[PDB]
Design a binder for this molecule. Structure first.
Ligand SMILES: CNC(=O)CN1Cc2ccc(Cl)cc2[C@@]2(CCN(c3cncc4ccccc34)C2=O)C1
Ligand SMILES: CNC(=O)CN1Cc2ccc(Cl)cc2[C@@]2(CCN(c3cncc4ccccc34)C2=O)C1
Ligand SMILES: [Cl-]
Lengths: 305, 296
């Protein structure tokens, strides 16, 4: 019993964190095999950030301009290249602690664990989701750039995020491990803001099924809804449109609890209209959207209470 | 910016988790040096233990079987002497925590870690964790510099869905026993010093809507707090909140008057750090560490 925001064990990722220093800038890098991946803005000064020409800044660099530190040992850089917004530093030593890994690009609504680091040293681990506006509500301070987001499936670490910047509203933006940003953001100090955020409907529904699995049914009603009528109401509360794909993905949870997806949708409609009236669902006074249908199946029991 | 419930990096603890099987029971063990620590319920425990031999205990570390060469009991924990010392043993201490203090839990099943989360020892000595059958022997810990302080070992789930366990010396937190009997968690209270710390964290992150021009005496605050099932705030708590009071410029009794108004009038459609409830599972030190960048 119980339902907590759970992160993956971070050990396999801790063994990859290194410190990258280029001139006056110091941030984090991910050491996998003989390559260290880090944000390309490590070659930038604060002035350069306004309109940086990365290609022109990088051509002026040699290998020995980059200092890589793994624990107390200095790694020697023997090559360097740029791939989108990520800098790839070829080092002389392969990481003996390299896990089985993949680089995956996630979609909004997907969750992942973040290992927050400063000076190549991990300080904390937390779970979060890629928001519909492509930002993450993280906890990052100056020096956390290069911190990574990941999932662990069996013994394989799937790297999905590298931290690059903080937006004016306090949210965070970054890239996949191939250097492609999530969202319409640039690694430039431009007037850029996160788009209006929305609630991840499929995730809220999954968490309502998790509450039913843990023995909470007070929010259920005798009503059903069409998918179209649900979306007209949901849009009014800044909820993401629920697609047929989302309904298909919610199938196993509907079968396990015996509550059809469109009947759970009718409960959500009523929850939005009424609020909770002094009640909580899984110890929360708000509707939680950072647990996917796959997270609920992973954490919750196969037997409903 | 941002404020999340953050756990310590679990790597140093992952390298210690093993699977312990004794007959029909399979739970988790903590392998430190040549000893494996696990709940004694894996087996009148003195009479049950005398009937067991070393080879009855099956210990698995990854894909390798560890050979048990000795066994002893210390309170509610079983200590299995094994043939191999753990090469991944970190610098460690066994510490007993007090209610209100927080820690990270590495939840395991079959000696394999599956997740990490942060939680607090409730005033009623239970933890609101996320544990399924097979999670017994999962451990709670803090990291300070390079030393892992083990503070909790999971034993059981109570009828309300909350969890109970021991320190690493086998002494239970709370009035619980390790057996099938009628036991329930006592009435719980809110950890006031922790709620105050989290209000200071909201001010640090730019949220001041809840502040007012008022102050309160410590006694008047406690009379109000006692009515909302809040733990009494002591002078020690006020002293511990000193650094956060100095950093934000808001006196502890000034922040207490903001909490008093939130308790009597609610939030009124407003949230604090994305929460519609007053959060009590961040200590004053957790707030300072998350808003400073302390690494391990
Ligand atoms: C908040 N931004 C700034 O003050 C200036 N920043 C412009 C800027 C523009 C583009 C890019 Cl790709 C990087 C950056 C910086 C690099 C570091 N960084 C940060 C990252 N994470 C969390 C932070 C928390 C506090 C302060 C800075 C943080 C940035 O946003 C710097
Ligand atoms: C809920 N408990 C029971 O039904 C009976 N339980 C008696 C019992 C008596 C003494 C002791 Cl020291 C342990 C125990 C059990 C052993 C495992 N365990 C559990 C622990 N965590 C999470 C669980 C989730 C679901 C079911 C069991 C869980 C217990 O409390 C089992
Ligand atoms: Cl995805």
């Amino acid at each position: 019993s119980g339902f907590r925001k759970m992160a993956f064990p971070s050990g396999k990722v801790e063994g990859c964190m290194v410190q990258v220093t280029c001139g006056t800038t110091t941030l984090n890098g991910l050491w996998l095999d003989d390559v260290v991946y880090c944000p390309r803005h490590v070659i930038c000064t604060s002035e350069d950030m306004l309109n940086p020409n990365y290609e022109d800044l990088l051509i002026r660099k040699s290998n020995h301009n980059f200092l890589v530190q793994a624990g107390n040992v200095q790694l020697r850089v023997i090559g360097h290249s740029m791939q989108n917004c990520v800098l790839k530093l070829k080092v002389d030593t392969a990481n003996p602690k390299t896990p089985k890994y993949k680089f995956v690009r996630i979609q909004p609504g997907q969750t992942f664990s973040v290992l927050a680091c400063y000076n190549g040293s991990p300080s904390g681990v937390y779970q979060c989701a890629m928001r519909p506006n492509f930002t993450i509500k993280g906890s990052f301070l100056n020096g956390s750039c290069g911190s990574v987001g990941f999932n662990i499936d069996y013994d394989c670490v799937s790297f999905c995020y590298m931290h690059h910047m903080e937006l004016p509203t306090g949210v965070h933006a970054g890239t996949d491990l191939e250097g492609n940003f999530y969202g319409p953001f640039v690694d430039r100090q431009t007037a850029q803001a996160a788009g209006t955020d929305t609630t991840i409907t499929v995730n809220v529904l999954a968490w309502l099924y998790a509450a039913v699995i843990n023995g909470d049914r007070w929010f259920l009603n005798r009503f059903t809804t069409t998918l179209n009528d649900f979306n007209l109401v949901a849009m009014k509360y800044n909820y993401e449109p629920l697609t047929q794909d989302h309904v298909d993905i919610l199938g196993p949870l509907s079968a396990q609890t015996g509550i059809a997806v469109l009947d759970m949708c009718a409960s959500l409609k009523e929850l939005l209209q009424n609020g909770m009236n002094g009640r909580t669902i899984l110890g929360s006074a708000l509707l939680e959207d950072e647990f996917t249908p796959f997270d609920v199946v992973r954490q919750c029991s196969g037997v409903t209470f």
